[PDB]
From TrEMBL, chain C:
Assembly behavior: Component of the gamma-tubulin ring complex (gTuRC) consisting of TUBGCP2, TUBGCP3, TUBGCP4, TUBGCP5 and TUBGCP6 and gamma-tubulin TUBG1 or TUBG2. TUBGCP2, TUBGCP3, TUBGCP4, TUBGCP5 and TUBGCP6 assemble in a 5:5:2:1:1 stoichiometry; each is associated with a gamma-tubulin, thereby arranging 14 gamma-tubulins in a helical manner. Gamma-tubulin at the first position is blocked by TUBGCP3 at the last position, allowing 13 protafilaments to grow into a microtubule.
Name of the protein this chain belongs to: Gamma-tubulin complex component 6
Phylogenetic lineage: Eukaryota, Metazoa, Chordata, Craniata, Vertebrata
Subcellular location: Cytoplasm, Cytoskeleton, Microtubule organizing center, Centrosome
Record's function text: Component of the gamma-tubulin ring complex (gTuRC) which mediates microtubule nucleation. The gTuRC regulates the minus-end nucleation of alpha-beta tubulin heterodimers that grow into microtubule protafilaments, a critical step in centrosome duplication and spindle formation.
Family in the record: Belongs to the TUBGCP family.
Superkingdom: Eukaryota
Gene name of this polypeptide: TUBGCP6
Amino acid sequence: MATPDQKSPNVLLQNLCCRILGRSEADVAQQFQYAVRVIGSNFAPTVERDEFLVAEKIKKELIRQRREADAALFSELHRKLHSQGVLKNKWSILYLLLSLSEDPRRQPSKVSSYATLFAQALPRDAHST
Amino acid sequence: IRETLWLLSGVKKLFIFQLIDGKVTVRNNIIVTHLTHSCLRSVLEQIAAYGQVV
Amino acid sequence: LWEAALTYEASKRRCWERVGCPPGHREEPYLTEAGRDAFDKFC
Amino acid sequence: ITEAALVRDILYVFQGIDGKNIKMNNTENCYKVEGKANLSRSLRDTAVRLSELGWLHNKIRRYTDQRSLDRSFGLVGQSFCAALHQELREYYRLLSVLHSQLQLEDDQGVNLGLESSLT
Amino acid sequence: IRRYTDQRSLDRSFGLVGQSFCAALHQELREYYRLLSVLHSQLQLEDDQGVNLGLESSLT
Amino acid sequence: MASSSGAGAAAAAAAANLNAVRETMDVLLEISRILNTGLDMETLSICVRLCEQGINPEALSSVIKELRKATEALKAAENMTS
Amino acid sequence: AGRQSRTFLVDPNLDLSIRELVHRILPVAASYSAVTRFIEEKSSFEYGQVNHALAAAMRTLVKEHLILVSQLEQLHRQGLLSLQKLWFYIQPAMRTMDILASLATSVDKGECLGGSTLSLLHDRSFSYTGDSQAQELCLYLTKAASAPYFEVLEKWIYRGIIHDPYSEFMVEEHELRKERIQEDYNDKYWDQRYTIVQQQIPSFLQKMADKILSTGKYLNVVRECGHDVTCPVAKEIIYTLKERAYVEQIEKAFNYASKVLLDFLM
Amino acid sequence: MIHELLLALSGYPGSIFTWNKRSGLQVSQDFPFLHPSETSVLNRLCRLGTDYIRFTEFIEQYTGHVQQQDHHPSQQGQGGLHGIYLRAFCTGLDSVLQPYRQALLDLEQEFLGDPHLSISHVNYFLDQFQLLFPSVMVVVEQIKSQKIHGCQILETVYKHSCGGLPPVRSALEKILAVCHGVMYKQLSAWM
């Protein structure tokens, strides 16, 4: 019977820390404080709210993992997500998922090289945020 | 679906499927939202043939 | 709150007469079959 | 000419089919955009670039269909046709995904100028 | 500065150290041009918005 | 060869319908002439559409007679006042 | 017109400042077109596997460029792209494309193939020693381009087999008549079975070429002696710019082959 | 429309998909809700659907009809499909069409699940059967034309079983396995 409503960052961070560490907020106070300090001064005006870049990055990663079929499945999932109007900040969700993604090959147990390319994305900084 | 099951259960006097000369016949003025009249008619004709046999 | 609401299950019943919300709408049987209270109402 | 019509034509070309405004020119063995004035020359060139891929697709599918029926091609020929069909199936799956995305974009009714718009 | 950069970017005889210096100069020039572009974008936003926004972006 | 079956059949059906409409209009014109009904092709098509829409032939005949009497009276009045 | 850079016509009624900015920016698109022409030309199988791999890497970079262009298109669709923002965003991409185009034009003018292509790549990488982004790009390109060349080197040193359809490796095999190899005073077996292609010697392998030659000669001798040699030191060869680890691996393989051959002879 | 399309593929022709005894299953007319290129693609799939319909018609012709008790059962196999080999052939055809029916039902369910799916998804999903079915249809037409009877039908199937298409190879292996089961039953009776 919960209706989506904007809850303070503290509540979300507390719940997140509890579930990640699997301990009470009292047992993660130091980590909570460190995370709070880092997070509390971080606004992303430089992130380009463009799902296409994230999707392309995901496809390239899957290809690197020899998972072209998984890339197609991911594309279909992204299409379905676009069909649904539940999420508003899809670029943010995709960026978060990709950043928190862990390569099953890193299938295998490691990944061949990390020659990060200049490809990357946009800086959006050009706008007067 | 329910009327089809009742026909296949051997129920007589269905509203859509009328039994004429021992032949189950579909009422002509029946339409379903998801089927064409001709397609529905063909499927119901196969079902009606089996119902007439029963 | 969105995540507590996420844990809600919904009916798998779909129909090809409905496309905008195919979450089911409970055909609700009728001819006897709606149970004792409906039979009492019918009586 | 709306971009959406170009999208439809491109989806057909991916199937090797001539669009309403883009038709296969057998003399050029390529799909040609109908000479309707409202096509941008840049858009025309882009359409030609895509139509080369559509022409190749249609040619490949014609070849596969023509040779798949020849029992005299032998087992190796049948296997080659089968491999071509498998790769074509993968391509068609991708094309289906793109087409479904365009169809979903049409279905949502919202002119979302989002990066998800079929450019 | 741009004339100097163009004059030295073409000189293979500048050697690896000279090329590295020119590259560093080009990187700093890119940063400067980025800053100039940001300022230009702010002024363009002020012109395009039509509002006399006394924001730091207004072209004074 | 696969793609052609829908549009070709649609075109053949349209041509057959046009020929059938022409034949029906000719038959109706012949019937009207034998009955001395006085209907033209355009009028015959309009009457056919009205009959297809369910108009009572007695109601239609009474309406037609009243409209014809009014039209004849208006033409006679225009010729008498000129 | 010919092997010239693509030229653009600007409407004469355009702003002079706009026209000059366009003339300054247009070079990136000219580089893109030239790169596409080079890719399409060198993409023929006749140009050898090294050139094919180079073209494939170029295609990957072209895909990345297209992605960038699509992102700029998206920004424009948002109306968020100004000419100054466009110039700023394209400046690094412009420089990368210009470096790539210069490398492509140098390779095309030199007709570099196989070891000559590797030498040209090495020289270009030294030419981009000052551009860390260009250096990274060249390093990626060199590592990719070494794959077929290092595969050929591995095959020669570990099996003594030349599988070179395009004759790109620094070692060339000549058919010496074995019948006269024992009879004729000339070491046709020793001298003609494996020959060094000086032009096909990679500059990064030039210092080890003689050791590579000896290794392949030894492997060929062992195969011609009827001794099947499984190289125990066979490892993937990776191009490296700072470390000559491949040189040390080649020396280890040479020593292994030398020991095996000495034991065989004794 | 997708439900109607599946019904036509399920053998229920409608107003959109007309069945012609000569042409088989065909799209009846141009629909106003389809792009002419979409109509062309749909009819291209309708070619496969027509082949399926013709296969089903053949199945009815060879299994759905009572075997005429012509005194000489050997000659019953010639004109009409009859014979134990004919029953096995019909059974194999129905078994091979069972996976196609299952795929069609799964497609119907999936399309019911997602209103944003297009016909292209079906065309992708059904392409394997769009390649499989034509070869089996050719084989069945050849069997009918040559009037293969009894175990001589088995020999022809074996010759056809040697085809190069791996999916066709597997299907013919299943059919051959069924025919060999029948043969083995007869051989058991004899031995």
